[PDB]
């Protein structure tokens, strides 16, 4: 039982469509739902539709604006968003609901602000620790998400500081740390994946 979504930045006033692709059968009888956790806390149910009879529900703060729909065949469903706006910025989860399961979710940002590739400066690491603690600095990108990988086995003890908007009208920066054994560095090679979903923009910086 799993779920699949797809989404990005959008110009305010612009419109956007989201998807979900189901396995675990039962895409015909079982209804399904989108609901968003906004920033500032996490928040709110934005929609749903049923099994046969294919009824459509949402709340009043959207109504005419957002549309939900299902295709039993392609097993997916699509959330239609239009006249996107301030509060519409929020992280959207496709979901199933049982009578008698929560998807990955995907990030919509309502902005005209240009998607901009991040740049990444390795923070190279002083007396001898006995543990070497490694940063990878990510700066001046937009919008989110971003995923910093030290690639698998090392991501134990790996930490991504939540990113904050660069004071400039907006733009972002993030850092991450891998804290490593001192017989590993300089010796065993060590490098981070900074990956920005929207722009393509996969990248690798070997700390030096």
């Amino acid at each position: 039982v799993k779920l699949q979504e797809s989404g990005a930045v959008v110009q305010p006033g612009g419109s956007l469509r989201l998807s979900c692709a189901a396995s675990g059968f039962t895409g015909s009888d079982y209804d399904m739902s989108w609901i968003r956790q906004a920033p500032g806390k996490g928040l709110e149910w934005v929609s749903g539709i049923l099994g046969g009879s294919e009824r459509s529900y949402y709340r009043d703060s959207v109504k005419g604006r957002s549309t939900i729909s299902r295709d039993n065949s392609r097993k997916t469903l699509y959330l239609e968003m239009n006249s996107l706006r301030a509060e519409d910025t929020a992280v959207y989860y496709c979901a199933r609901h049982s009578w008698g399961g929560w998807g990955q979710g995907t990030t919509v940002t309502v902005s005209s602000a240009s998607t901009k590739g991040p740049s990444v400066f390795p923070l190279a690491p002083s007396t001898s620790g006995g543990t070497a603690a490694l940063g990878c600095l990510v700066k001046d990108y937009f919008p989110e998400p971003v995923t910093v990988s030290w690639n698998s086995g090392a991501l134990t003890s790996s930490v991504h500081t939540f990113p904050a908007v660069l004071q400039s009208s907006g733009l972002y920066s993030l850092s991450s740390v891998v804290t490593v054994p001192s017989s590993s560095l300089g010796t065993q090679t060590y490098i981070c994946n900074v990956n920005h979903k929207p722009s393509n923009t996969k990248v690798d910086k070997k700390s030096c």
Partner: protein, 234 residues
Amino acid sequence: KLRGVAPLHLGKCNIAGWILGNPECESLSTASSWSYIVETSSSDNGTCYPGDFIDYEELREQLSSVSSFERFEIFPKTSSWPNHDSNKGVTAACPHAGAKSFYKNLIWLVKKGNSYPKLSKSYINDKGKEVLVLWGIHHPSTSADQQSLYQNADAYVFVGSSRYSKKFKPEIAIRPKVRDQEGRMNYYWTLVEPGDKITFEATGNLVVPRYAFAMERNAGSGVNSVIEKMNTQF
């Protein structure tokens, strides 16, 4: 002396009033089952909007032997009614402290902005249960009252599924004002077996269901080893 010991004694409404969504309601056991009901008769109060409950005694029995009981939201008030205005449906028959409210389980439906397109709606039981839907039908006092509400001169109300089918027409006439109401709420019920879809088809005068109910039933309604099997119970 004792024929007694019966479950769920109503404190406030009466079968009709309560199972209807009268605001006087809200007491006693969020959900349950029982052997049979009990009523402080609210008669001089009853069901706030006046009118006739048809098949009342057929039902009063039908709610006796109940095992399963669940009130479900059959169709939201919300997203069910796109083409006609949903909350105009309040009247001074059934006020919630302060403002005049309406019944809970029912949406009293009216034209949005000078329009009443043909109302089309259905429902389909996936239960192995027997779903019971209640609605009502309103006959205003005056042709102006008709038109003020539903805009549709000749307005027919059909129904759905199999076990029950019918067709209704509104009667625009002036009854004695009871709670200043010269009109009538007539009330009704049906039983949707696990398999069938009850349909509603309306050009007006129909008071839609929102919450519905779900239940079930039965006939007859309202030396040591051998010892190791005990006796019996339940």
